[PDB]
Amino acid sequence: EGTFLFTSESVGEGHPDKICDQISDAVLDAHLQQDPDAKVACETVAKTGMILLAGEITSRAAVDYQKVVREAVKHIGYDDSSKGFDYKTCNVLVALEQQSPDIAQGVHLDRNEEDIGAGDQGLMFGYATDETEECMPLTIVLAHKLNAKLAELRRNGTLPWLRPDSKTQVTVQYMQDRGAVLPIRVHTIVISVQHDEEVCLDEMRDALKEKVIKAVVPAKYLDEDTIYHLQPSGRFVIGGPQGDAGLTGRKIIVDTYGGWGAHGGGAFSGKDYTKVDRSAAYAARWVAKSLVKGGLCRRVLVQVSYAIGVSHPLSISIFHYGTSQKSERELLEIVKKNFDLRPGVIVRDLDLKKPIYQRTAAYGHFGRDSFPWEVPKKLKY
Amino acid sequence: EGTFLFTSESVGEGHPDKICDQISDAVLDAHLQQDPDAKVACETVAKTGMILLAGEITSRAAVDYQKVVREAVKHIGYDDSSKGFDYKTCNVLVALEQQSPQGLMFGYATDETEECMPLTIVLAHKLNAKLAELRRNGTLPWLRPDSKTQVTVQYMQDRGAVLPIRVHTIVISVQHDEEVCLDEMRDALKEKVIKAVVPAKYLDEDTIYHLQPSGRFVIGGPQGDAGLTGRKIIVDTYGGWGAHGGGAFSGKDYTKVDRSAAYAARWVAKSLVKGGLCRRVLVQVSYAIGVSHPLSISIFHYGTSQKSERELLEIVKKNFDLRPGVIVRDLDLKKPIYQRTAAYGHFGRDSFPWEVPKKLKY
Amino acid sequence: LLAGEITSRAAVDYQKVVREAVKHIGYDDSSKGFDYKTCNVLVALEQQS
Amino acid sequence: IPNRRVLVTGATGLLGRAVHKEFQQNNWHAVGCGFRRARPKFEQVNLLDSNAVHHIIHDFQPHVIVHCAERRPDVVEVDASGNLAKEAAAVGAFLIYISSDYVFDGTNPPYREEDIPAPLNLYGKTKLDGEKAVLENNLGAAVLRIPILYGEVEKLEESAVTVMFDKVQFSNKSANMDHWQQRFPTHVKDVATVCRQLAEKRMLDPSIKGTFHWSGNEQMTKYEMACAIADAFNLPSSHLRPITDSPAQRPRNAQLDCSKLETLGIGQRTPFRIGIKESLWPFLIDKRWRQTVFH
Ligand SMILES: Nc1ncnc2c1ncn2[C@@H]1O[C@H](CO)[C@@H](O)[C@H]1O
């Protein structure tokens, strides 16, 4: 047949590499409140006792970094030596400078806003698939919503023995179909998630399966052979930044398409609208969703690239996996007519100065209701 | 038509995110060179005057991190306060938690270059390495370590494979001194660098040049931006081409499938194409929990093979042992080599094992 | 945080030293402000032989 | 959120994917089933498993049912067909047993809702056996008959009209094409609608049955279809031999007669220009070369 397997993963708010992605976006949000024109590249580190901030910021705003970090760590749910970590008593080192003068003069100074140049150079992709309502790959959609379900149940209390670190791998048996891909059945699910001392191992799997999995996954994709590795580590209560090493932007395939389509390198969190690693990556997603929802293809991947201090993209590229009647140039030409993909227009079109980034820090940036880039444009061809 | 664009990027040795990647594998080299069964997840954060080492280690080794850190920075070429950084003064904090005793990997290869790599990233790497070379001759003595490059190729689709027709746009930004004037640099980047690196057939008079489009690049290195280990994984792998589950390579030891199985996946895919069976291929190995052997393997040959996937797969099963334990043995993954990988990409390089095709009996 | 120059043959588990001392002093839970189990330990010693 | 119910057998196959979806875009609670490729889109139910069949008819409570139950050629050479009518009639479900024109001789056009059946082959015959079986186990059932079906296919072999497309594309190969035997292409999307309206009209008349005929108004042969198909994508047409030989089993025409069924405002006919052009664009060479999991 054309039957392949495929796996994508997500992680919980309280996984180190996602604590940083989220703290960084907190500091971003912070600055944007008092100053929407703040420039922010805040990379964050989480070691056993430590959250260290590092990066560069230009922002009129003054921010209490101690508070923003600790408030977000608290929101994440780490508050005792019982758990790995505790906002009340943790080390917070700051190493934030003013920003490089050589970027300022040749990126954002003395320029009519629609013609500000790229913050950096680089390449960004953006992808879409008719395989789900949200135009995202089932694998990565299910994967995220498991860690979402987990956290929701942690917070509202029905599963109080839950603790914020988690990981979820979701393997699906797919089938080709005139270029598009058709999910058939969930082949394997894995869930390790940090737990309390009290609750025993066999109530936890019983729980994961009926409270979490069954809620999230439509029974159509499950059958008898569907395999479940729920808490296959066992002794996962010692969990979080303790023992470990977090960094912002070490979960970029989780942050996006769970390994589908493509990715051009750029990390999202801790960066503002001038960093095209983020802005043009939300835009390219906007494009590829708008094309699919507008019925032009069932499946599409889009690439753009920028050069530092240059407003227009250096190259747009459309691959439609043979799923459109229109050729690939025909879609590309439609995209020229309907999108201005300079970083100064994208900020308007998607409102990228509002302090909303801490939502995007976990459970993925793409395929979610509220986000500006997820609202397809009515296209005029 | 059936003509398209595609772009890829690389960075020079001096880039803060890549500085970090070198130091993490420098630290790995250093440990294995004593205990060759060392277990290592070494992060490195680099920022103005700081190198921070973080994350679990288990080893029998005694490593003078000061020596390791500084010897890498010295090598990379940051030796005076004027460049923004100096291995003689830089602060070296260390937060490693030593002791003393699942998913999916992708490989890719293409017929479009001698090294079986998407042309876009090949040229991007060569430009950064060329710069570094010229810096280290003192042919271009006004060079500095941090740089960046991006190459947009104009391809043609052809029967599942891709045909590079021309270079369409090249971007180079490199850190320089405050003496040399702007024209001298852009005139040097074109002739002594780009024209030395790129086949003259792919260059013509429409090829768009962005040489120091930043305008002025004196402040850089860990100064100009924060740097972190494993933040350039698409530069480290296939430049946007192929696929990527999401493994950061550097600072991890051979016991990390993310790194070892990735290397083998490349080894395979390259062998297949070098072996005359495919023009292009992606190889997708999915390890599951409780299996020495890869549970599944899919081979996407973009229809460039006279053989079926099943046919192609079988060849692999009877040529390759992809049990993690065997991979480390077959590819000699206990040598203090890894620092050499952490710059100009892990794939497409001849010194490396996983880049030497296994000749295929089938 | 540890700072400053040493010259020695001994190899020393600074993690161990710093934590077993902080325990003996009696900082055992984050209820108290400090904990030998959860605290960061940075080392910045400049050691030769 | 809809009330009255439809079950579609062979809803994994070409005819049934249209039948099921055509009900379920005009407010019906629609549930197709199939033996193969059922999950996730349809229920898993083997027709020759007599227990499982009633198990789903019981549970769901279908007011109207539509049997279709392949890889077309064949076009050269059952019985739970009717066992379904037994079970379907019990629960008060109007069964529509889709059948082939191949039940006939093929000597005078047309053939009527009434005419004498005389099958010349394996296939033709056992489609008759199914009509008896269906109808005598329950004389409250329509035997809606159809000609050759093209439709919007997933693999070419799903239709005897579509299998030809490879032949039509490659000029470098020459192949022959059957002109001896007359043919009658019909969209499954149209049969989907005739099946839908012959059900919404089982209330506006509470007793309809006793055989029904439906076809498309576009007379062609394998060859004449092929050249339309070239002319839809604008391809070279002249690598294609006609024939009037018999490379001896098939009918040489049948043609259906849709008097009764047209009468009640029950019909739809998508032109073959478009019908087929919309079906076969994904199997253009250039689109096939472009259809891979990764770019
Ligand atoms: N003035 C500049 N022009 C172009 N690139 C730069 C400049 N300053 C820093 N960079 C590069 O871009 C990244 C952050 O913008 C840094 O890691 C560095 O490699």
Cβ atoms within 10 Å, residue A335: 21
Stretch 52-111 of chain A: residues touching chain B, C-beta under 8 Å: 52, 54-56, 95, 97, 100-103, 105-106
Nearest CB among A47, A81, A88 relative to C37 is that of: A81
Reply yes or no on whether B183 is catalytic: no
Q: Are D208 and D216 in contact (CB under 8 A)?
A: no
Cβ atoms within 10 Å, residue A192: 19
CA pair distance A56, A42, nearest whole angstrom: 6
Of B2, B133, B11, B125, residue with least CA distance to B77: B133
Does residue B95 have a known ligand-binding role? no
R_g (Cα) of chain D, nearest Å: 19
CA pair distance B281, B301, nearest whole angstrom: 4
Alpha-carbon torsion, ordered D21, D23, D24, D29, to 10 deg: -130
Distances from the Cα of D241 to the Cαs of B25, D73, D237, D244, in angstroms? Answer: 68, 20, 10, 10
Alpha-carbon torsion, ordered B284, B288, B290, B291, to 10 deg: -20
Collect all residues of chain B within an 8 Å Cβ-Cβ radius of residue A270.
Answer: none
> Which subunits count as partners of chain B given 3+ CB pairs below 8 Å?
A, C, D
Q: Point out the catalytic residue in the list A152, A177, A196, A244.
A: A244
D5-8 and D29-34 strand pairing: parallel
Of A259, A316, A260, residue with least CA distance to A283: A316
| Domain D1-295 annotated CATH 3.30.200.20 | no
Q: Which atom number of ligand 1 is nearest to the Cα of residue A100?
A: 8
CA pair distance A306, A326, nearest whole angstrom: 27
Q: Per the structure block, which two tokens stand in for A242?
A: 């303790």
Helices (H) and strands (E) in chain A, counts: 9, 11
Q: Is the dihedral of CA D106, D108, D110, D112 positive or negative?
A: negative
Q: Are D13 and D69 in contact (CB under 8 A)?
A: yes
Q: Are B239 and B8 in contact (CB under 8 A)?
A: yes
Cβ-Cβ contacts under 8 Å for C40 (sequence gap 6 or more): A47, A48, A49, A50, A90, A91, B95
A315-319 and B39-40 strand pairing: unpaired
D186-187 and D175-176 strand pairing: unpaired
Nearest CB among C15, C42, C47 relative to B93 is that of: C42
Q: Per the structure block, which two tokens stand in for D165?
A: 């497309």
**Ligand 1 pocket by Cβ (under 6 Å):** A 100, 102-103, 120, 308; B 15-16, 146, 148, 173, 214, 217, 220, 224-225
Query: A265 vs B232: CB contact, 8 Å cut-off?
Result: yes
Q: Is the dihedral of CA C4, C8, C14, C19 positive or negative?
A: negative
Alpha-carbon torsion, ordered A129, A130, A132, A138, to 10 deg: -40
Query: D292 vs B159: CB contact, 8 Å cut-off?
Result: no
Cβ-Cβ contacts under 8 Å for A21 (sequence gap 6 or more): A44, A248, A249, A251, A255, A267, A268, A269, A270, A361, A362
Of B204, B125, B208, residue with least CA distance to B169: B208
Which residue type does D35 have? F
CA pair distance D16, D19, nearest whole angstrom: 5
- Is the peptide bond between B350 and the residue preceding it cis, with omega within 30 degrees of 0? no
Delimit the domains of chain D by residue range.
1-295
Query: Which DSSP string corresponds to D54-100?
Result: HHHHHHH--SEEE------TTS----HHHHHHHHHHHTT-EEB--EE
Reply yes or no on whether A56 is catalytic: yes
Q: Are A136 and A366 in contact (CB under 8 A)?
A: yes
CA pair distance B217, B227, nearest whole angstrom: 17
Enumerate domains of chain A plus CATH numbers: 1-10+138-238 (3.30.300.10), 11-114+239-275 (3.30.300.10), 115-137+276-380 (3.30.300.10)
Technique used: X-ray
CA pair distance B127, B149, nearest whole angstrom: 7
Of D51, D67, D91, residue with least CA distance to D8: D67
Residue with structure tokens 């302090």? A355
Q: How far is the CA of B349 from the centre of ligand 1 (A)?
A: 26
Question: What are the residues facing D44 on neighbouring strands?
Answer: D34
Query: Which DSSP string corresponds to D115-175?
Result: S-----SHHHHHHHHHHHHHHHH-SS-B--EE--EE-S-SSGGG-TTGGGHHHHH-SSS-E
Q: Are D210 and D96 in contact (CB under 8 A)?
A: no
**Residue B168 φ then ψ, to 5°:** -110, -45
CA pair distance A26, A23, nearest whole angstrom: 5
Resolution value, angstrom units = 3.3
Q: Are A317 and D287 in contact (CB under 8 A)?
A: no
CA pair distance D13, A299, nearest whole angstrom: 23
